[PDB]
Amino acid sequence: MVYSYTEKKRIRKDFGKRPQVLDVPYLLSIQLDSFQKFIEQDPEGQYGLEAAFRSVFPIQSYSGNSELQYVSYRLGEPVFDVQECQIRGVTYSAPLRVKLRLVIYEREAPEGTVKDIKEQEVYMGEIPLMTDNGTFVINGTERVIVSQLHRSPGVFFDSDKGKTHSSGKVLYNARIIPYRGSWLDFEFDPKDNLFVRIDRRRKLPATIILRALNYTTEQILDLFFEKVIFEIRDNKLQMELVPERLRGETASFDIEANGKVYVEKGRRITARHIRQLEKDDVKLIEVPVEYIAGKVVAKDYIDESTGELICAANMELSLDLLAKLSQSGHKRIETLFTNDLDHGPYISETLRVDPTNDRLSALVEIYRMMRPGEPPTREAAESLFENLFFSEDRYDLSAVGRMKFNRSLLREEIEGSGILSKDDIIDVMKKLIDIRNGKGEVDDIDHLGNRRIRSVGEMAENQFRVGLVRVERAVKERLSLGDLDTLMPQDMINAKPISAAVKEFFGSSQLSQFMDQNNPLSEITHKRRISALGPGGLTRERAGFEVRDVHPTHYGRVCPIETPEGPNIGLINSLSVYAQTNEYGFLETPYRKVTDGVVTDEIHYLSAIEEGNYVIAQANSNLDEEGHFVEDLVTCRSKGESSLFSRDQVDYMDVSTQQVVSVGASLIPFLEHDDANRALMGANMQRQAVPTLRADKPLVGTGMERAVAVDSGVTAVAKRGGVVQYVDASRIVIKVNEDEMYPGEAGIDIYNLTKYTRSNQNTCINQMPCVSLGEPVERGDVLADGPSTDLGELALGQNMRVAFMPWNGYNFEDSILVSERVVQEDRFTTIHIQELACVSRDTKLGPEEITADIPNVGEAALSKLDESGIVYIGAEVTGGDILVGKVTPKGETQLTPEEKLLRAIFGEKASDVKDSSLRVPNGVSGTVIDVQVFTRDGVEKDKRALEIEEMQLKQAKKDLSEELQILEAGLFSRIRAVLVAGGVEAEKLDKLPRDRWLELGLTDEEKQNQLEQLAEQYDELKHEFEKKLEAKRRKITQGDDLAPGVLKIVKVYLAVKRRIQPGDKMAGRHGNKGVISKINPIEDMPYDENGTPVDIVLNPLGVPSRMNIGQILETHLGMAAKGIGDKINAMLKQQQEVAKLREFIQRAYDLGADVRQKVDLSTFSDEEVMRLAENLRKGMPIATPVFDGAKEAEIKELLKLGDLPTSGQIRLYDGRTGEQFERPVTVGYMYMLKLNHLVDDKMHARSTGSYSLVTQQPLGGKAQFGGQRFGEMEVWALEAYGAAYTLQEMLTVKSDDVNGRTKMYKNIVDGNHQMEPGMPESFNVLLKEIRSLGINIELED
Amino acid sequence: TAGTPSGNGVDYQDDELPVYQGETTQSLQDYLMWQVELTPFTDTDRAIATSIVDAVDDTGYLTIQIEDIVDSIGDDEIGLEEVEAVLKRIQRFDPVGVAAKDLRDCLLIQLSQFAKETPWLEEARLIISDHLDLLANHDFRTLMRVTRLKEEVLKEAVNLIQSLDPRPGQSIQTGEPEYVIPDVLVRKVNDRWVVELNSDSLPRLKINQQYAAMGNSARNDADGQFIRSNLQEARWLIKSLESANDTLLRVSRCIVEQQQAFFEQGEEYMKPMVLADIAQAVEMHESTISRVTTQKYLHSPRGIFELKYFFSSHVNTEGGGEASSTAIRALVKKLIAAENPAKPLSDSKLTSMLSEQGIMVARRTVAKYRESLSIPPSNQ
Amino acid sequence: LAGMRGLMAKPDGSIIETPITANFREGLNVLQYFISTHGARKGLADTAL
RNA sequence: GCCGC
């Protein structure tokens, strides 16, 4: 109850101090949720290929009276599981079946049909399926698909920082992004004129796009500017009063209200004068005629006398024009605002820029500008404009884009059409204009409320759609030429494009890559990884400083520690441990609600905008028993800032301190005592550790090891655990409890533990059981642990006894001095597994055969080969030993007498067949582990192959017969009970088989009902088991459908052990890395008064300049933990009675300063106490959470309880002289990792090898026997030294001088040492290249 | 595919302007000239060494005559006396026995470099190699009397002879190109044996040609319209590829429908298919169909991989109508293979048996068929 | 290490009002560590550019 | 993609 069965075996001492409102999530649900929302069907078109099918279908050919009606879809059962797919090198996928109907509409009868063919489903493509861990086995690999962080579709406003023209002018722009389609831009020039950039074309003014929507300039003037009425009647020329707008102006003349002076001429304008004028109710008042001079007419007044009129909108008025309008009878004149206090002159200037005033003129202008080719015919432009925007197929904003668009323009409605309307562009332009005027503000592009997340399901759906659209195109054509006989499969099913697009996305894509398999944590980090790159993302060089910075909205969504260092810094991120994604696709983090002065356990998820709106308290703020804050003033975050607020002010509280730390970083103990940039290094280096021979738990942890170990899918977890029945190194069988069962056939649980196997990084993945026999097992318990796991806890390193001192220069800089006891005990020893393959294919000469006999090869190379010609399982191979014997035929039809003689003395082939065999590459020492012969259907089965088939079927029947045996035992028990009910013979009945001829008939009811039904069930069960076994056997032995050329494939696996060596690289998890400098004999290491030496010596100088204080605290706490373990071990040695051992364990567990973890041995079984004590005999596994953990005083009292010095420093003696070191030296225990950087994989030397055909220069890189590049800076250094002959020998011979190389080699062999330099071939190549242009270049004499 | 082979190792030059560049390889003559440079030779000796190394075949044998080598030099005091000395020096190189005049020379040179205390060195140094080589080719029963030695010692003298390397100089040879076949025309077994054309990549070339040429044309950044620059070049490319594919498919279809008897039941059921037979079938000239079927390969579950094999114009004046020699050749191979230990297989007897079977073939015609890929089993 | 971590802020170059009053011998808060991550990232990005 | 700057 309080502790699970796997956790009662070894309990970590948590240092806690803060209860947890909610637990930690799976961390891999993201991938699972995305793909489940992809493959899974939905009653609506909300999710699943269903949405794409409804988007494309129904499809009809033009004037074809023909339709394709779509009804449902179904996914088939895969033919192989994950394991067989991974061992065979194929893709783990499922067949896609969709049912559709073809209906023929009547040509004579409108809207009528004549035929409707609803044939069964059709097959197109294969959909790859993700495994239970969130990986895609394609071509037998792992291939995790990384999520992408991109800009959400919608509308965004920017200002380009206001430094473009160097005049201090801030230029504001607006931008519209759809999910798919062309883009739209609105910009401001330094002259303040609206410009529209459609699809990143040349700049065009907004008036043409305004008019293309059938908008006249007059209509545009009223919408663009508020109009004011000017009335000139009886020469009064009164002005309408708008006191609200009249804020800043100079009175050109005396202003009188109803004949009474209100504001004098040039009287200072005061909010007081405006208020006084507004208080007095005044009608229209006269103004000086000269003032209207600067006004601009809005409408186009018509003259009642003649058709002539002043229609010149956006134009001023003249004094002579006043007489004209007076004569025409224009009593009222409409003019726009013409005011520049907050408003400004816009639109009208753009109207003056371009004179096109017709819809056709604007359409032809935009068609010519966007497409500079053939002029249109009133139809090309009309069609193009519809294609650009507001087209159902060409342009579409997503549901996220529409929501963001409505939110940015402050609209109540959230849903809407996927295409923009006339009003949307008007609103965007109005908002952009208002932004400059002062109202509104520019938004942040790096704000996490503007950045969306796409996972694997959405990208897969997008790719499926392109295949649909592609296939739909071809479908449309054949409906035109399709007779009634034509059927859907014959209606251009076109399975090729869909499968091609799907495999293109899944196999060869930027976000598709191998999952890092060095450790379970590394796989988890790759699975929970967010990238800004990709197709819809941003390129590396196109990024900038501000994009790669930590934003305040990154708080509980992305950890500000874990990120790559050099080129990808700030562009690859990781989810925080609690973060979740919105349905639209925005990151969320949970908070605890606060009501009144008390927090409530109800939890709300808030996006970046949601969190910003409320005042959120901090996780480390003290609370009372009732939930009220102990301290009135509390620290909170209000709007991207932090300050003191009252407890009532807080509306939410941080659920946990870790909320801001990634799962990988969550594993650094004493993280808050480490530099953030330095911690980055530790978190990054934690994922490069390689699992060793035996896993060792961390003595100091954080409490997150169990979640990482279990959620990664590396261990074996009891899905429906009952009681363990059979255990083995390869199998675990569990008898499920009867309290929960599936009626009928009963059932047991079979787990096939994974043995040694290759990983993507050539390491070994192995599983070992944790249960012994007859052990009770609850649901979710760990049965077997995988690589780098110990009793269900992540264990990726080993616990080293370390002293912090300088030792004779052998730990200078970051060097590490290691004792020989570490090497002898096989700690930091790893297993590496390699895969070599050999394929036989038919050739023009003939088939390529695999045989044990090989021409021109001695018996010594054939010692390890099988009769077929393959290395024996378990053979140890080195150098260039032969693995598989293969011979290819040669071409010869003219039998020369010498050739006939050769055939006469020697074999019939006379070694005509060449030797093309799989040999071990040099530098590769391996032991034969697994052979995987695959054979083509029809060709003779390999002699070794039948053995593999026999092992396969034997294992199949072995793991299949258990359920049959249990079922037949149950049937026998039922029959025995029935015969006991009547005519029981007891042992006599039990002795005779077949229930002693079914115990005759006995009573009529028993014979007719009981015995008959029992026999029928027996026969049916036997037939079903036989059929299942036969089906499995037939599946096992089948011809492998291979590539047409391929005839046979043989795969060989090698296993090697990597001994720890100095050139190897080691690290702790605080950013402290180093390579080994020396492996010291045990008698030379420093030792303490008890004679115990240290294992590692580390330099103290690396700590103070790195600010790695977590190193020292971890060392001290490890010393305390090992001291407690030492006390327990000493007690167990002397066989002390259980009571006082339990008392000491209890005393150690309840130590601390008000820690939350409460454990009492009182409710512990007496035997379970012994088992726990033996499990923590090595040391007590302490756990210190990330930002809420152990303190110095607690470490000190644990040290006191362990009977150790409180300072953490002891006396040490020199192992070589026996003298005591002057100062006390810190000694403790630290968790050390072995990284995947080895000298063996990094030692290369070349004297002479192959050279590139072009430039005649040696190849580059190991695995190709290349030479080191002597770059430009190396040549600069040689020039600076003055070493001319060294440079000439590097530049000429020994590089590109073809004759100089051989002459120098001959001279060196002769002991002459004379360069005799010539001319490099690269310069000749350059001369030829330049001459290949029109330029003549020559060498004069 | 039930199982898929791992991708073969490939490479391409990165961070280099002439992409893919190349790679040098070592051959037999390249490795022999390397040894020539590192041995003490004079100028004339080096010239002779280069002259005779150029004449070394892939097997490592000397295809040209020694007298022809002397002629090639055309220099005074370069007679065969010193050409022979340089030749022996070169023969004693790392592939011991290389650049040898004939098979006897290989074995004599190889046997010279031994412990000189080998149990049967002198027994096989000259007695078997330098003399009665044809006897060793045969059963060599009389060779025991010729060499005045028992058969027991010869039983292991010939064992040492076989222990000597048959063709030295082909061991250093690499052999990277496997000359594998993609089998452009896979055909399968159905109720009527349907055939298909794979590796067309025409849609793949169509899509790429679109996205490049028509993509640039549709890109309205450039003034005007590129409807003729590349848009009407991609169409020509697609038309050419589709025409070639259709012609190949039709020709292969005609061959398959004519030679269905080969694939069905036994293999040796070939009709003597002349070029005109398919020329009339496709209503097209034989030359165009011939050029097409020269190096095109088909993938068969049992059949041979090669279109040209089906032509077999071998009417052979067979009894009832006509027949094919390739089928007759397979029949002769099967008959000669299944015979008595004596295995007479006389060209007269074999021809008589074939005529009795119904193939009226001349006595010498069968002899040429047998000598094409076999030898008479003591028929003489 | 033994005194205040001090005043620092690099989101755009300004300075946060309340400084980090904790050293590394004592722990940092979540807020103080989040504040220091800005300068850490700024330095690490400056190095690689 | 990673390592050393």
| Cβ atoms within 10 Å, residue A973 | 10
Backbone discontinuities in chain C, residue before each (C to N > 2.5 A): none
Residue with tokens 């977890």: A717
Closest by alpha carbon to A1041, among B187, B300, B1, B189? B1
Closest by alpha carbon to A1248, among A1288, A1304, A1321? A1304
Please identify among residues 101-120 of chain B the ones whose CB lies closer than 8 Å to any CB of chain A.
Answer: 102-103
| C-alpha–C-alpha distance, residues A73 and A51, integer Å | 12
Residue C16: enclosing H or E segment and its boundaries? Answer: none
Q: How far is the CA of A564 from the C1' of D2 (A)?
A: 9
Q: In degrees rounded to 5, what are phi and psi of residue B339?
A: -140, 180
What six digits make up the tokens of A623? 């609370």
CA quadruple C11, C13, C17, C20: dihedral sign:
positive
User: Which residues from C are below 8 Å from A676, CB to CB?
Assistant: 33, 36-37, 40
> Are B31 and B172 contacting, i.e. CB atoms less than 8 angstroms apart?
yes
Residue with minimal CA–C1' distance to D2 is: A564
What SS3 state is found at A881? Answer: coil
| C-alpha–C-alpha distance, residues A182 and A199, integer Å | 6
Q: Which residues put CB within 7 Å of chain D, the nucleic strand?
A: A 513, 533, 540, 564-568, 572, 684-685, 688, 1073, 1237; C 48
> Are A877 and A931 contacting, i.e. CB atoms less than 8 angstroms apart?
no
| C-alpha–C-alpha distance, residues A628 and A648, integer Å | 10
What six digits make up the tokens of A1275? 């040549």
Q: Residues 6 or more apart from B114 whose CB is under 8 A from it?
A: B121
Q: Residues 6 or more apart from A1303 whose CB is under 8 A from it?
A: A1293, A1316
| C-alpha–C-alpha distance, residues A556 and A619, integer Å | 12
Beta bridge partners of A263: A255
Neighbors of chain A by Cβ distance (3+ pairs < 8 Å): B, C
| C-alpha–C-alpha distance, residues A131 and A134, integer Å | 5
What six digits make up the tokens of B260? 């269905």
Q: Does the distance separating the beta carbons of A1250 and B3 come in below 8 Å?
A: no
CA quadruple A77, A80, A83, A89: dihedral sign:
negative
Q: Does the distance separating the beta carbons of C31 and A642 come in below 8 Å?
A: yes
| C-alpha–C-alpha distance, residues A564 and A1092, integer Å | 41
CA dihedral A1176, A1178, A1181, A1182 (to 10 degrees): 120
What six digits make up the tokens of B171? 């061991």
Report chain C's terminal Cα–Cα distance, integer Å: 29
What is the distance of C-alpha A474 from the center of its chain?
35
Residue A1070: enclosing H or E segment and its boundaries? Answer: none
Residue with tokens 């029992």: A1014
| C-alpha–C-alpha distance, residues A1299 and A1320, integer Å | 10
| C-alpha–C-alpha distance, residues B308 and B329, integer Å | 16
Q: In degrees rounded to 5, what are phi and psi of residue A109?
A: -95, 115
Residue with tokens 């053979």: A875
Residue with tokens 């005559």: B65
| C-alpha–C-alpha distance, residues B90 and B67, integer Å | 17
What six digits make up the tokens of A1174? 């033996």
Nearest CA in chain C to A541: C49
Which own/partner contact pairs does A367-371 have at CB distance under 8 Å and 24+ positions apart?
Answer: A369/A201, A369/A202, A369/A204, A370/A198, A370/A199, A370/A201, A370/B220, A371/B220
What SS3 state is found at A201? Answer: coil
Q: Residues 6 or more apart from B21 whose CB is under 8 A from it?
A: A1252, A1253, A1254, A1255, B13
* DSSP letter (8 states) at residue B308: G
> Are A127 and A502 contacting, i.e. CB atoms less than 8 angstroms apart?
yes
* DSSP letter (8 states) at residue A628: B
Q: Tell me the nearest-neighbour CA distance from A29 into chain C, angstroms.
A: 26
What SS3 state is found at A123? Answer: strand
> Are A364 and A375 contacting, i.e. CB atoms less than 8 angstroms apart?
yes
> Are A676 and A811 contacting, i.e. CB atoms less than 8 angstroms apart?
no
For chains A and B, CB pairs below 8 A equal: 147
Nearest CA in chain A to C15: A641
Chains B and C touch (3+ CB pairs under 8 A): no
> Are A1248 and A1306 contacting, i.e. CB atoms less than 8 angstroms apart?
no
> Are B198 and A938 contacting, i.e. CB atoms less than 8 angstroms apart?
no
| C-alpha–C-alpha distance, residues A97 and B147, integer Å | 81
DSSP string, A446-498: S-TTSEEEE-HHHHHHHHHHHHHHHHHHHHHHHHHT--TT--GGGTT--HHHH
| C-alpha–C-alpha distance, residues B343 and B335, integer Å | 10
> Are B296 and B250 contacting, i.e. CB atoms less than 8 angstroms apart?
no
Q: Tell me the nearest-neighbour CA distance from A905 into chain B, angstroms.
A: 5
B196 Cβ under 8 Å from any chain A Cβ: no
User: For testing the chain B interface, which of A838, A1252, A1301 should be mutated: the one with the most B CBs within 10 Å?
Assistant: A1252
Per-residue burial over A871-905, b if 16 or more Cβ lie within 10 Å, else e, is beeebebeeebbbbbbbbbeeeeeeeeebebbbbb
> Are A94 and A78 contacting, i.e. CB atoms less than 8 angstroms apart?
yes
Nearest CA in chain C to A636: C31
| C-alpha–C-alpha distance, residues A817 and C10, integer Å | 40
Per-residue burial over A554-586, b if 16 or more Cβ lie within 10 Å, else e, is bbbbbbbbbbeeeebbbbbbbbbbbbbbeeebb
Angle between helices A1192-1201 and A1109-1133 (to 10 degrees): 20
DSSP H stretches of helix in A319-398: 319-328, 348-353, 359-370, 380-388
Contact positions of strand D to protein Cβ (< 7 A): 1-5
* DSSP letter (8 states) at residue C20: B
Q: Residues 6 or more apart from A16 whose CB is under 8 A from it?
A: A1152, A1155, A1156, A1157, A1185, A1188
Q: CA angle, corner A1164, sides to A1162 and A1167, nearest 5?
A: 130
What is the distance of C-alpha A279 from the center of its chain?
66
Residue with tokens 């030829």: A1328
CA dihedral A432, A438, A440, A445 (to 10 degrees): 70
Beta bridge partners of A513: A144
Beta bridge partners of A835: A1053
What SS3 state is found at A849? Answer: strand
Angle between helices A359-370 and A380-388 (to 10 degrees): 70
| C-alpha–C-alpha distance, residues A275 and A1270, integer Å | 83
Residue with tokens 């197109």: A124
Q: In degrees rounded to 5, what are phi and psi of residue A677?
A: -65, -40
DSSP string, B130-180: TS-HHHHHS--TTHHHHTT--HHHHHHHHHHHHHS-SSTTSSS-------B
DSSP string, A1093-1145: BPSEEE-GGGTTTTTBHHHHHHHHHHHHHHHHHHHHHHHHHTT--HHHHHHHH
Closest by alpha carbon to A63, among A492, A488, A476, A469? A476
| C-alpha–C-alpha distance, residues A55 and A40, integer Å | 17
> Are A1246 and A1266 contacting, i.e. CB atoms less than 8 angstroms apart?
yes
User: What is the 3-state composition of chain A as percent helix, strand, coil, each rounded to the nearest 5?
Assistant: 30, 20, 50
Determine the residue type at A1133: K
Closest by alpha carbon to A440, among A428, A449, A458? A428
Closest by alpha carbon to A765, among A1189, A1055, A552, A1151? A1055
Resolution of the experimental model in angstroms, please?
Answer: 2.8
Angle between helices B28-37 and A1298-1309 (to 10 degrees): 50
Q: Tell me the nearest-neighbour CA distance from C7 into chain A, angstroms.
A: 15
Per-residue burial over A635-649, b if 16 or more Cβ lie within 10 Å, else e, is bbbeeeebeebebee
A1188 Cβ under 8 Å from any chain C Cβ: no
CA quadruple A733, A739, A743, A744: dihedral sign:
positive
Residues written for chain A: 1341
Determine the residue type at A727: V
| C-alpha–C-alpha distance, residues B145 and B155, integer Å | 14
| C-alpha–C-alpha distance, residues A815 and A1074, integer Å | 5
| C-alpha–C-alpha distance, residues A1223 and A1226, integer Å | 10
CA-to-CA dists, residue A480 to A65, A104, A108, A432, A483, angstroms: 9, 12, 17, 49, 9
CA-to-CA dists, residue B326 to A170, B331, B332, B366, B377, angstroms: 88, 8, 10, 11, 21
DSSP string, B96-118: TT-S-SSHHHHHHHHHHSS-S--
What is the 3-state secondary structure of A1200-1246?
HHCCCCCCCEECCECCCCCCECCCCEEEEEEEEEEECCCCHHHCCCC
What Rg value do the Cα atoms of chain A yield, rounded?
Answer: 42
Q: How far is the CA of A666 from the C1' of D3 (A)?
A: 24
Beta bridge partners of A157: A174
> Are A448 and A573 contacting, i.e. CB atoms less than 8 angstroms apart?
no
Closest by alpha carbon to A449, among A575, A588, A653? A588
Peptide bond into A58 cis (omega under 30): yes
| C-alpha–C-alpha distance, residues A227 and A343, integer Å | 13
Q: CA angle, corner A404, sides to A398 and A405, nearest 5?
A: 90
What SS3 state is found at A160? Answer: helix
| C-alpha–C-alpha distance, residues A1097 and A1095, integer Å | 7
Q: Residues 6 or more apart from A729 whose CB is under 8 A from it?
A: A753, A755, A768, A769
What SS3 state is found at A275? Answer: helix
* DSSP letter (8 states) at residue A798: E
| C-alpha–C-alpha distance, residues A36 and A58, integer Å | 25
CA-to-CA dists, residue A857 to A238, A866, A914, A917, C12, angstroms: 118, 15, 12, 11, 73
Closest nucleotide to A571: CA versus each C1': D1
Closest by alpha carbon to B328, among B308, B343, B312, B305? B312
* DSSP letter (8 states) at residue A713: T
What SS3 state is found at A526? Answer: helix
Residue A152: is it exposed, middle or buried by C-beta count within 10 angstroms (0-12/13-18/19+)? buried
Residues written for chain C: 49
| C-alpha–C-alpha distance, residues A209 and A347, integer Å | 12
Residues written for chain B: 380
* DSSP letter (8 states) at residue A871: B
CA quadruple A902, A908, A913, A919: dihedral sign:
negative
| C-alpha–C-alpha distance, residues B290 and B293, integer Å | 5
| C-alpha–C-alpha distance, residues B246 and B254, integer Å | 12
CA dihedral C27, C31, C37, C39 (to 10 degrees): -100
Residue A154: CA count within 13 A, CB half-sphere: 24
| C-alpha–C-alpha distance, residues A1053 and A931, integer Å | 7
B373 Cβ under 8 Å from any chain A Cβ: yes
Nearest CA in chain A to B227: A373
| C-alpha–C-alpha distance, residues B228 and B233, integer Å | 8
Residue with tokens 């003037």: A221
> Are C28 and C19 contacting, i.e. CB atoms less than 8 angstroms apart?
no
How many helices (H) and strands (E) in chain C? 1, 0
What SS3 state is found at A376? Answer: coil
CA-to-CA dists, residue A67 to A97, A300, A498, B5, angstroms: 19, 54, 21, 44
| C-alpha–C-alpha distance, residues A21 and A985, integer Å | 65
Beta bridge partners of A604: A591
